[PDB]
Curated annotation (Swiss-Prot), chain A:
High-level lineage: Eukaryota, Metazoa, Chordata, Craniata, Vertebrata
Quaternary context: Homodimer; disulfide-linked.
Domain Saposin B-type residue range list: 1-74
Cysteine disulfide partners in this protein: 4-71, 7-65, 30-40
Section covered of the full-length record: 292 to 365 of 377
Further comment: Pulmonary surfactant consists of 90% lipid and 10% protein. There are 4 surfactant-associated proteins: 2 collagenous, carbohydrate-binding glycoproteins (SP-A and SP-D) and 2 small hydrophobic proteins (SP-B and SP-C).
Domain of life: Eukaryota
Protein name: Pulmonary surfactant-associated protein B
Cellular localization per UniProt: Secreted, Extracellular space, Surface film
Organism: Mus musculus (Mouse)
UniProtKB/Swiss-Prot annotation, chain B:
Maturation propeptide residues: 2-74
UniProt-recorded name of the protein: Pulmonary surfactant-associated protein B
Localization per Swiss-Prot or TrEMBL: Secreted, Extracellular space, Surface film
Gene (name only): Sftpb
Residues of the full protein shown: 292 to 364 of 377
Disulfide bonds: 5-72, 8-66, 31-41
Misc note: Pulmonary surfactant consists of 90% lipid and 10% protein. There are 4 surfactant-associated proteins: 2 collagenous, carbohydrate-binding glycoproteins (SP-A and SP-D) and 2 small hydrophobic proteins (SP-B and SP-C).
Length: 74, 74, 72, 73
């Protein structure tokens, strides 16, 4: 298998793990707040679609590996 | 207002920290799915580790990211 | 002199150019909507700071060049 | 009337296409800033152009970018 193949598989798994861990990670971050715990958690929930869109999708693995210089090499 | 901005930066910073810490394990898991090419996959990761770890934004990016989400006006 | 220096300077200049060009580019994109040109331009106006925030800042040059493999 | 999501995706894709088209000249001009080794800078740009151009998102990324801005569900 090529290096491009390795790069996409490795990055795809990193993004998949990041996407699934992000809700819990952001929820826990709100625990650092006192009088403002609930407002923080409501913020996280209300903006969850936006926040989760911060992780690239599997379709982006190739162009990301191109940026690293390993996919679709001349 | 700035408290929403405060929430956004804190939750996003935590997600990025969690993602960065998990990335080596995640990429390792991706190479274990290979049989004859486990070693080749792991070699790719080792040679490109500084680049791959650079795929997670740094805390300095929390404010502008939250500006893109529409919560940290300026 | 270092490749890292070249990479950071060159990418930052591209981002500055992109940031400078983005308002006109988005205005032209609204021309593709027929009968809803003003609604599209109204969207652009309402979300301009967010859209402009999509261009990375100079502070991101180093980590971007690190991903490209030229800055440690 | 058409959706805000449709405006957002078209507007961002247009911006990215403009950036991608302008990037080669912009980076070439950026090397003029180096007065001791301009040719070395231009060599870096040329050698790494495929990587540099890949920093512009592709049209397939319009939806998720507009989702991050909060306009596409």
């Amino acid at each position: 298998d090529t290096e491009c193949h390795f790069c996409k598989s490795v990055i795809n798994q990193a993004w998949n793990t990041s996407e699934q861990a992000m809700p819990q990670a952001m929820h826990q971050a709100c625990l650092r707040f006192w009088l403002d715990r609930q407002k923080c958690e409501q913020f996280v929930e209300q903006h969850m679609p936006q926040l989760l869109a911060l992780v690239p999708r599997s379709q982006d693995a190739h162009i990301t590996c191109q940026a690293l210089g390993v996919c679709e090499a001349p």
